[PDB]
Design a protein around this ligand. Structure first.
Ligand SMILES: [Ca+2]
Ligand SMILES: [Ca+2]
Ligand SMILES: [Ca+2]
Ligand SMILES: [Ca+2]
Ligand SMILES: [Ca+2]
Ligand SMILES: [Mg+2]
Ligand SMILES: [Mg+2]
Ligand SMILES: [Mg+2]
Lengths: 476, 476, 476, 476
């Protein structure tokens, strides 16, 4: 149980550890270092040295080659990383393999982006030459959650490194073993010691210490709105900018002229993937009245066949990350049952699934009231809420009727309607007749309102990890 | 003494006023509405309706013409606005006129930028078309300080309007009469009611109510770091992004091979302008040892010739904004004198200048210790701190040695040295053989560290006043 | 009867003028100077002095203000300019007014684009700073045709002026009076003498002398493919780049699910406007078999009700530009008739329309073979060729089955189909459920294949009128 | 002796060949295929199939992976490629190796630019969404000369492939063996058959057939101005755009305050590299009068120390490409000597150098008249023309005084003068206190005047190998 600081695995200052639990059987199988304020201090110091040293001395093209080599390392180590991630997060091996493949894709994409991050030359007064350069913030802080340790890591650190920053990472205490191994791969790729630091530990300890640290120049946060609020307010003490990738209540909007055959599998996977433990999960399906009942029936058909089991069983769902989250999903379903919200359909936990595991079957509820907590708050489970609308105006009103605004899905044949809704919908991403089929590495991702602010993924991410400097030359 | 809400002049909800004081004589000559939370509520309400209605229905090109007409109105009203601004802020008529001209330039520039704010189409999978659109936040909140009411209004509101946002403005209680008149010009120019809303009042009342309001989508702040911290933390409750344009300790770096004849007047005006009450004021001059004593003597002679009087007198410098700021400057100078920091030279207030006025002659101090409070903290007065350096390395160390990082000036003939230093210096702007060519409307402005974060002015500002939406179309 | 050179109206070197004919009655009412090689020499030399002098010294922002003022003068002179254009070209007064308004819009758009034409800073080796500047070619040559003298002038020259070039224009001998007046307006607007030079005359004289002149740095050509070929080959002697805006055979693609009510008036206007004398005129309509006969019937009814008469009569259509072009249209129709191609319907020429005028009623032909001359060659008359297709594949095959690739229209409600075809169609512009909008000033316009190459209109045009200079600084 | 068409090596149509000559000894050692029109026809048809099929179906990201793999293959085969290039061109093995590394760098650079070539979304009218897509031309033609077969193949084909085109290449009959080998490595890299086609042969046979072919959509030419003129006029028949990378007379401007110690080896290498057979070779040095004589003598010593021998000997310079070019350089030297132009110094050809080789010692001539042919015409040999200037004005006048305008070098310590001159110089690239740097892959390259037009290298090149399509959607 050691942190990764200055290119070496180092013991926690206060020498305490945190258990690593396999959510498939709920049993500990490893430990991580319990990071504290002195651990963060050592990490920032190392990151500062690397940025002001070798890594910062590297050209963008040189940073790109390191990132490209790292991408190859991840690709060669897909099965190894997929095993670690699946055992640690609980997701089926098929999804953990996809996450590893996506991780290598992040590094590959940004590897080519490094030397193509351009500034500008601006028209100005006579005898003047104005140019702008996009420089790294310096030391970037990264808070990575448990639902996608590798994907969000490659998303955040991959862009920050490409921008020329040195990084300090505080991954989630419920899943972070994959991140540690990736750090080893980065060292093998030729990444200078200190350019990437990992401090494991609790959010209120290691995470809070990072957000309060004056040695950080920029913070990339992914997690709950409550914690995002705290991190922002903590970082404000040092006037440090924070990107917020928070939760969401993303709607699927289905009209009567939609191809329900091609829409059905996507609607299911959008809420079943990673057990619904995804910020951009399609947790709401809004159906035009004409096809409300027919689509619910198809959704009911699919959900009834879904099965939940151990990660290694590679079924539709694995277990949830822990008991606390399992109880949270239970509370949503229990409340809904009390309020007379009909459960249209639900999956099943396999009989041989470990009792000590935290398993929850996918659930499809219908006739959900728009104002009801189930349709307003993020469940972070495989629970889909279905309700009807009468026209485009109500579709828009319902879709934007929650405090969240992350992603939205539009399913209709009419092209004019497609682009028209996409403009009215409040979301960082709008998908038309799909829902993030590809990895979405190239697609800038982020929310509005209580889904946070800022954009990561895509080329756009590099702008958030750099700060513009304007140079004005008077030469006559 | 009224607010400007929904295109009409409205009495404050609680019917109380705040005295408007001419700092040239320290006497009240007008009153403003003491804005409170209900006033902010109505302002945001009006902005939201305007954004969802007429103003939001307007195309980019249509918004541009509105700003262009406003630009012409301001240009025609330069003398009128300059008289109001100078009387309220205390700055000389020459500077007050320049501010109004800059205000017109902001609106002129952004008028042409409105329909040229482009999104992107991104390479993606086969059968896919990916496009991005840069949409306004919606309702933008604007905190405007007293030192440059018109100029900062122009860069903030001008960019926000061009981006398609509806604006709620809380200008400074110490000076905001010019902004109120600008709002009328906007109405004349054809800006729909509600698109621009002005709520006067105290920062801890009206200003706080803005920062707390959940109906605002983005905040543009310009002021003290302490206040900027609070505003950020207040807005974090609603996950509202805040741009921070804070203070600075901007250095002038002079080498032995520099053109002292050309540098000398710029070194002076950079700290004399607006009585040194400027975020990016050149409050530090770093001189190479070889020319340290000669340049100090020339700076001393120049400072002795500076005259301070009433704003109508239109001299080198006017009074400070109030007694609280005057006392703050006194405390800096008294502490420096007690610690044995020699005052090389100072200007003199003219005899007939009102005793009740808040006059402070520009002061030149030498041999200032880098770690001393005079060289570390922002004075916001006409005080220049002078010290020497041996080489480029120490110049960089001294320049980046404060918590601030907003603007830096480089004076040297060596071309290689110019660019080499510009890369090393920590600042949003670096000026080579000049210092703010004026008005720097096209030049993106912003700080690092305790100088804040984010960028305003120039085309780049539009990216801060919009949010990227990605649309992924699966069409085959 | 004089050229516009160096800010003054100067007599030609041959003094033998060219008649200006009103196509409404075929009678001359004015004269233009017959420019030859010596007239071109003085114009290029004048523009060279302007680019090296006052005009080249102006900032990008200063150039914008000139263009904005010119926009205002055109707007103030819409009636006068439209009167001239209508009398000279023959187009109905309503279309002449639109041309003038579009001219003012071009100047307005590029007035705001001037100081926003950014270059880049490129990531490079350590100790280096690489910046790119987009500098004007110098002296640009402009060949402007007779069908849209004002709009194409504003398109071509308005962009070249914003880019910072000085212009030498050779407008069409069949219609150029309006351009001469605009040149006066430009002078009144504050455009330096020599920045804009107009040399009237025959294409094989003044036009040929312009394309051959070594003093020109860039040629903007709009006209026939045969002449564009010759101009390119002539300019090849001086290695001068030429943008070729040539004709087309732009198809309108209508599917069975399209809105025929919304499509029908656009289908008609797209070929009737300016008497079909438009490069991007919708000269083909491709209809799905299911709605082939019903649409042709409605098109036939629409065409039978069309009225042609003198320009001042302001009917659906005016006369053609001259006898040669009238005969050209006659040849096409006569050729089609003899090949058994049916004429579904035709318009009406008013009985009191002057016999000496060049009138041609709009003609609708059906069942046109795809390989036939009528469906392959540009008519430049109000002639629409109708045919059917069975599926998207044939629709694409037919649409891309001519040497031309300029504009294409897609009429259908199927969203996926809209985007599918748009990517497959070989054209510079693809319109979905409209045709040409909407002015199209902001829309980059150009062709592929025999429709020419390069792009004008929109912001993109500035790249065609500038050349990239890369400055690589080694500073260590 | 075969072409590379449709992924396999096929025999010539007429089965005739061309001798491959080693310029070191002027002896034949291999043969290339004598390509004619039918060979070109099969090459274009193959490229069309690849573009309409597999290669065109590849996503931008997929194209990049092939390019990166090819980049790795070139790096793996540097020694083999360097040996082939040196023996075929005559350049020293050291330079041929650098050419190989440059080739790998081109593929690496464009591999990452592939999925990052963005289009735009443009602000337009209400109810509209406008997007722009940058599409490949389709089939691109590439004329590659003999001086830098690998490097020019890299910048031209690498960009075209990254842009999504299929390529038909006609390399120089004097040196094209390395290009053939690279084609194999492309196939090994996974590049689909037909995506890259190589047709060897004489320019008046294979080259002319390529330039005239209507199946080509875009021509990338690098060679003599005379041939560049023909190609343009040949392709003008099909309205095919041609990028002209032609020769130059690039000056080095040295002032009295310049670092002569750092400048001296660069001044020499810039003209000595590849025996002066470089379009952007520094064939002129302009020296301020104060340091004219000291620098001439300085350059004289350096030139006198130069050694010329066989390529394998790996000295300062190899032989010229053939007898024709050798005679050309001899004619230049004869005229200069006959006109009394003094030769300050010259290199040394080893006395035992192969008599049947085409060797030429580098020559430094002084007091060269600006109007003399040696100072106006491109020699394409290791000849440097030295002259003096009084001030910056004369320096600019002399630098821009030739019909060429490709690259320019500025040597001075004064920063203002650096940027001031950089704006005044007519060139595609301006280097400050360096010249060409290293590789210059990221630096957009191109000329003005008789240096041609269009830009290649850098990210900018992608715009030259794509065409802009605009899609205007009316959706309400
Ligand atoms: Ca775990
Ligand atoms: Ca006041
Ligand atoms: Ca006429
Ligand atoms: Ca016939
Ligand atoms: Ca050879
Ligand atoms: Mg928010
Ligand atoms: Mg900060
Ligand atoms: Mg063709």
């Amino acid at each position: 149980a050691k942190h990764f600081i200055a290119g070496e695995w180092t013991l926690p200052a206060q020498l305490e550890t945190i258990p690593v639990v396999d959510p498939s059987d709920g049993q500990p199988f490893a430990t991580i270092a319990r990071g504290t304020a002195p651990d963060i201090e050592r990490a920032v110091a190392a990151a500062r040295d690397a940025f002001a040293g070798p890594w910062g001395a590297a050209s963008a093209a040189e940073r790109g080659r390191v990132l490209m080599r790292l991408s190859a390392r991840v690709t060669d180590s897909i099965e190894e990383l997929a095993a670690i991630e699946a055992r640690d997060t609980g997701k089926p091996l098929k999804q953990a393999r996809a996450d590893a493949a996506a991780l290598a894709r992040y590094f590959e994409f940004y590897a080519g982006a490094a030397d193509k991050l351009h500034g500008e030359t601006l028209p100005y007064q006579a005898g003047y030459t104005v140019l702008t350069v996009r420089e790294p913030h310096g030391v970037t802080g990264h808070i990575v959650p448990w639902n996608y340790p590798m994907q969000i890591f490659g998303r955040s650190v991959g862009a920050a490194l490409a921008a020329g920053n040195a990084c300090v990472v505080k991954p989630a205490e419920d899943a972070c073993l994959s991140v540690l191994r990736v750090a080893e791969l980065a060292a093998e790729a030729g990444l200078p010691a200190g350019a990437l630091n990992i401090v494991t530990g609790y959010g209120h300890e290691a995470g809070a210490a990072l957000a309060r640290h004056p040695g950080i120049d920029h913070i990339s946060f992914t997690g709950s709105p409550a914690t995002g609020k705290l991190v922002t307010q903590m970082a404000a003490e040092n006037h440090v900018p924070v990107t917020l990738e928070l939760g969401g209540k993303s709607p699927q909007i289905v009209f009567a002229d939609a191809d329900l055959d091609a829409a059905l599998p996507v609607l299911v996977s959008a809420i079943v993937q990673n057990g619904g433990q995804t910020c951009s999960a399609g947790s709401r399906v809004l159906i035009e009245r004409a096809v409300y009942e027919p689509l619910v029936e198809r959704l009911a058909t699919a959900f009834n066949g879904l099965r939940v089991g151990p990660s290694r069983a590679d079924l539709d769902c694995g277990p949830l990350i822990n008991a606390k989250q399992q109880q949270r999903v239970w509370d949503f379903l229990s409340d809904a049952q009390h309020d007379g919200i009909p459960m249209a359909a639900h999956g099943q936990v396999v009989a041989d699934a470990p009792e000590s595991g935290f398993y929850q079957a996918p659930a499809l509820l219908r006739d959900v009231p728009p104002s009801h907590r189930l349709a307003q708050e993020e469940v972070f489970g495989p629970v889909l809420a279905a309700m009807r609308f009468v026209d485009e105006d109500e579709a828009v009103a319902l879709a934007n009727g929650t405090p969240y605004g992350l992603v939205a899905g539009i399913w209709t044949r009419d092209g004019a309607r497609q682009m028209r809704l996409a403009r009215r919908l409040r979301a960082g991403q709008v998908f038309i007749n799909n829902y993030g089929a590809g990895g979405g590495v190239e697609l800038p991702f982020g929310g509005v309102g209580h889904s946070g602010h800022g954009r990561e993924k895509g080329f756009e991410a590099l702008y958030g990890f750099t700060a513009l400097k304007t140079i004005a030359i008077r030469h006559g």
